[PDB]
Amino acid sequence: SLALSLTADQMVSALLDAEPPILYSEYPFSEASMMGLLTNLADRELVHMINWAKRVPGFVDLTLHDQVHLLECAWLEILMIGLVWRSMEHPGKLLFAPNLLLDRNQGKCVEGMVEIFDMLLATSSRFRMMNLQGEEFVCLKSIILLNSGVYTFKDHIHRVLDKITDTLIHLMAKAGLTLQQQHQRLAQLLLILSHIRHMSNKGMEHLYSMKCKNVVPLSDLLLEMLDAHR
Amino acid sequence: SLALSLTADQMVSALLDAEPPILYSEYDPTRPFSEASMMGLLTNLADRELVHMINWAKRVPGFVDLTLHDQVHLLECAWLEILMIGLVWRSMEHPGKLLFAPNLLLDRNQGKCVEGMVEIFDMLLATSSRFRMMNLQGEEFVCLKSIILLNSGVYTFSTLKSLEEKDHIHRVLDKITDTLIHLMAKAGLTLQQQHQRLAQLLLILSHIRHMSNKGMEHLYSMKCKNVVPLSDLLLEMLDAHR
Amino acid sequence: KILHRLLQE
Amino acid sequence: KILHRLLQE
Ligand SMILES: Oc1ccc(C(c2ccc(O)cc2)(C(F)(F)F)C(F)(F)F)cc1
Ligand SMILES: Oc1ccc(C(c2ccc(O)cc2)(C(F)(F)F)C(F)(F)F)cc1
Numbered sequence: 454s455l456a457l458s459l460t461a462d463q464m465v466s467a468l469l470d471a472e473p474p475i476l477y478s479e480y481p482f483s484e485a486s487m488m489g490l491l492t493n494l495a496d497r498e499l500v501h502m503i504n505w506a507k508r509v510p511g512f513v514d515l516t517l518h519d520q521v522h523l524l525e526c527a528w529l530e531i532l533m534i535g536l537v538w539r540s541m542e543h544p545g546k547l548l549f550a551p552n553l554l555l556d557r558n559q560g561k562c563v564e565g566m567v568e569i570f571d572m573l574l575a576t577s578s579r580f581r582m583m584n585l586q587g588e589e590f591v592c593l594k595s596i597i598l599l600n601s602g603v604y605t606f607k608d609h610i611h612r613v614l615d616k617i618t619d620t621l622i623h624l625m626a627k628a629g630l631t632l633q634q635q636h637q638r639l640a641q642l643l644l645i646l647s648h649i650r651h652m653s654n655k656g657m658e659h660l661y662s663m664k665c666k667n668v669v670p671l672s673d674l675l676l677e678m679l680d681a682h683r
Numbered sequence: 684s685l686a687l688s689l690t691a692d693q694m695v696s697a698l699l700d701a702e703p704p705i706l707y708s709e710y711d712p713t714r715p716f717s718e719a720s721m722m723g724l725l726t727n728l729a730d731r732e733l734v735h736m737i738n739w740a741k742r743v744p745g746f747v748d749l750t751l752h753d754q755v756h757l758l759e760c761a762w763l764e765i766l767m768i769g770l771v772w773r774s775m776e777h778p779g780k781l782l783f784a785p786n787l788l789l790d791r792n793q794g795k796c797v798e799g800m801v802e803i804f805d806m807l808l809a810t811s812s813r814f815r816m817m818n819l820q821g822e823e824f825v826c827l828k829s830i831i832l833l834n835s836g837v838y839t840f841s842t843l844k845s846l847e848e849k850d851h852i853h854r855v856l857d858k859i860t861d862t863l864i865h866l867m868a869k870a871g872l873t874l875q876q877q878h879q880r881l882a883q884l885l886l887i888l889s890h891i892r893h894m895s896n897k898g899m900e901h902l903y904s905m906k907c908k909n910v911v912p913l914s915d916l917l918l919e920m921l922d923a924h925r
Numbered sequence: 926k927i928l929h930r931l932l933q934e
Numbered sequence: 935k936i937l938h939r940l941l942q943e
Contacts, residue, residue, distance in 0.1 A: 500940065503937070503940045503941060506941075507941065517938065517941060517942070520941055521935070521937055521938060521941065524937065524941075525937070572838070572839065575838045575839065576838065579838060596886070600886050600889060601889065601893075604806075604809045604810060604813055604887075604890050605806065605809060605890075611883075614882070614883075614886070615879045615882075615883075618878060618879050618882040619875065619878070619879070621882075622878050632874075633861070635878075636860060636861075636864050636877070636878065636881060637857050637860055637861070639878065639881060639882065640856070640857075640860040640881065640885060641853075641856075641857075643882060643885040643886060644830070644834050644856070644885060644888070645838075646885075646886070646889050647834065647835070647888045647889050647892045648838050649889075650889045650892045650893050650896075651835075651892050651896065654892075654893065654896035654897075655896075658900070673936055674936045674937070674940075677935055677936055677937060678937070734931065737928065737931045737932060738931075738934075740932075741932070741934075751929065751932060751933065754932055755928055755929055755932065758928060758932075759928070915927060916927040916928065916931075919926065919927050919928060920928065
């Protein structure tokens with residue numbers, strides 16, 4: 454397992470490097486047209502996510518079954534944090550794609566949606582005011598992948614998780630933070646992951662309810678990822 | 684503010700002091716049980732714990748400084764997480780079993796006896812097992828429990844001023860973080876080890892949030908079934924979610 | 926509303 | 935599962 458022999462610098466660089474691309478939406482809204490765009494986009498993002506995952510140091514050292522488990526548990530969390538990250542510099546807005554930047558009022562066009570929009574926007578504002586950095590962001594995204602499904606199976610994953618922790622503090626020492634600011638920032642960042650998990654859980658219920666309302670058909674892939682949660 | 688001024692040690696003393704008691708259930712081992720009845724016993728128990736929890740919350744440094752409105756919100760958001768982490772804590776030294784009460788120690792086989800409850804029991808078991816392997820300490824557990832109360836509802840609270848309500852809470856959380864480091868440094872952990880353990884402890888809060896959400900969905904579902912009756916305070920806490 | 930009431934004591 | 939396929943390239 455190569456992941457453990459990497460340096461902090463190398464880990465960061467590997468992660469920044471595995472970053473998936475920002476996709477475009479198909480070029481006002483109704484429920485059907487809105488959910489159509491979003492689900493089409495989410496399906497494409499998922500394919501790129503799976504590929505990003507294999508590029509996360511340590512991820513591929515797991516059995517296929519474990520890779521499936523981790524991704525099935527964390528997929529929505531990972532989509533959401535990405536969404537929030539790139540929306541960071543668009544206060545009040547959710548940047549789903551460069552050509553699809555939505556605000557809250559556009560969130561009321563889908564039943565049950567505006568509640569989730571609000572949480573997402575809140576997280577974005579929190580990241581913004583924490584001045585979250587790209588290097589920190591990729592570490593967090595990686596932590597979500599390995600952590601979210603781990604207690605529901607391990608030493609390998611915790612070794613790697615520890616390594617990513619080491620990498621986060623490293624980044625902080627660099628920025629010139631004092632020991633006390635370091636452990637305070639680390640905590641602040643990791644506590645937001647709790648809110649991200651909550652948003653995921655709400656989102657999953659919402660998504661399930663929209664499948665039930667047969668508002669739009671979902672891709673087989675998206676339905677498969679959703680189904681792993683009941 | 685009294686809270687922002689305590690020392691690590693006074694913080695730990697304060698929380699240890701405010702610990703609610705362990706309650707007994709109406710379980711009668713002479714009586715064999717049904718899925719529904721065992722759910723009645725657990726519901727009655729949680730309802731009584733809730734009352735103790737609310738008065739415990741008042742004793743968590745900084746909580747009393749908030750508006751009644753903010754206090755209500757935090758508890759509505761955190762109540763089941765708090766019940767759950769308390770449950771896993773007292774089940775810690777009983778591998779494979781959940782210690783709901785001193786006279787009520789269940790293994791999963793019996794939890795399967797009710798509908799969709801087994802998935803939650805297994806998650807709860809997993810968490811205890813995790814606590815066990817980390818060798819979680821009592822002073823750490825009380826820190827974690829108060830972090831849950833303060834953190835879980837802080838992003839879902841908002842015209843301008845209430846913005847300062849959020850900043851006070853973040854300052855208190857920072858103090859509790861300092862407290863956890865203090866403890867780990869004391870136990871002779873290297874700097875690297877303190878950071879790693881801090882992360883390990885906080886990541887567990889993600890799984891607890893997950894369990895709570897799953898439990899909430901199971902509770903709302905019990906209700907819709909009118910088999911197991913819920914207490915009034917609890918139907919109320921449930922409703923604050925859906 | 927029971928919680929509100931208990932918090933006020 | 936489609937996920938299985940995708941993960942094995
Ligand atoms: O970056 C995305 C893309 C899609 C989504 C979805 C979503 C968006 C908002 C919700 O409240 C629920 C699901 C949507 F249904 F829109 F595709 C999903 F893929 F997660 F299902 C979330 C985040
Ligand atoms: O101290 C506790 C913790 C959890 C519970 C549970 C519970 C909570 C409310 C109920 O009405 C029934 C069970 C919950 F689902 F929350 F985890 C259970 F474990 F017993 F299932 C009861 C008491």
